[PDB]
Chain A
Amino acid sequence: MLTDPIADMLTRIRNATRVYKESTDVPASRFKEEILRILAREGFIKGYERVDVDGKPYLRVYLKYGPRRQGPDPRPEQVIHHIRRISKPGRRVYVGVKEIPRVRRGLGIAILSTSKGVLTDREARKLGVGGELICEVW
């Protein structure tokens, strides 16, 4: 079965970007859409949009890359150099507002899920709350 929907999505994204896909579909879920909202706002993805594949709901994720490069291998630098799942089924990970990590010395983010909604580490710290540590992106 599909054991971890959230992890499935981060991977679909990690996988598509590595081959430079423009778009990329992932089965829609309220929660997954909540995450994508941050991904866009934090500028990691051009954005995303609801779509119907074979009749079922999906979320097109519009990938973003750096510009073309010089020398051999003109492949663009990724905008999403990283994106790793943390809390996972059978090893849930929650943090207090004092334990919210500082990803990549601030240049990267961390998406938490708080009783105040899905926020980034900075947002969470502001609202002074903690919660399940969904993932880490940079």
Chain B
Amino acid sequence: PTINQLVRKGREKVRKKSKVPALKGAPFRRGVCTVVRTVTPKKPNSALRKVAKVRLTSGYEVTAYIPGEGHNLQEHSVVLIRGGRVKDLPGVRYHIVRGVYDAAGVKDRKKSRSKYGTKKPKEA
């Protein structure tokens, strides 16, 4: 583009689009479980991914992954959503925070406990 053109029209600044309408552009949002289904992976992967429909306080109804070996989520369990998609589950854009509200932490988690919200086991 000519300098005179740049002067006329000028460059247009790029606009990033969110990937997490956890509304309020908040760090976390709490919702209520609706369905504790279990989806199947995509393209190659295969397994029974544990998922959950959630009715957010942000007015949105979303699907969220439930990390961890085993969970305890039910129909009307209160939960906290943290944002983060799952490559295999088309339609799941947030993870559920384990160790908050009704979602119990993972039992027998002796490693990356910070995630999977499990307290420090007392070494006998």
Contacts and interface: CB of A to CB of B under 8 A. Distances in A.
Interface of A: 90-91
A79 B18 CA distance: 55
4 contacts: A90-B2, A90-B3, A90-B4, A91-B3
The prevalent SS among residues of B at the interface is helix
Interface in B1-21: 2-4
Contacts, number: 4
The prevalent SS among residues of A at the interface is loop
A121 B29 CA distance: 62
Nearest to B6: A91
B10 to A, nearest CB: 15
Contacts of A90: 2-4
Contacts of A91: 3
A91 B5 CA distance: 12
Nearest to A91: B3
Contacts of B2: 90
B8 to A, nearest CB: 12
A33 to B, nearest CB: 29
Interface in B49-74: none
A90 B3 CA distance: 7
Contacts of B3: 90-91
A91 B3 CA distance: 7
Shortest beta-carbon contacts, A-B, top 4 = A91-B3, A90-B4, A90-B3, A90-B2
A90 B5 CA distance: 11
